[PDB]
Amino acid sequence: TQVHPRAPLLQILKVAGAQEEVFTVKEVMHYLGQYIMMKQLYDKQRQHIVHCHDDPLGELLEVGSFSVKNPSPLYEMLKRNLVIL
């Protein structure tokens, strides 16, 4: 299934290197991972924790941090920011 990210999410994916406008959810997850990795938002010591306060990703997630093992804010963000084609 193909999705079109809303502008603010699309901005983030492009920072992370995405050249597409339409994505699969798998590709969106790939580029979010890339973004977090590139911007070094993960906690250095406990790397399942992602600190996104004072980053545009935090504005989309509406949270200052999240755990890769408690990913619902990520998924809820994607629900708000992906239009299914």
């Binding site: 959810v25 798998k26 997850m29 991972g33 977090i36 990795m37 993960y42 790397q47 399942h48 992602v50 890769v68 093992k69 990913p71 990520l74």
Partner: peptide, 12 residues
């Protein structure tokens, strides 16, 4: 261990 390792385990 590493963020990359952990991110790969996310259910899509």
């Amino acid at each position: 261990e590493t963020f990359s390792d952990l991110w790969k385990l996310l259910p899509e």
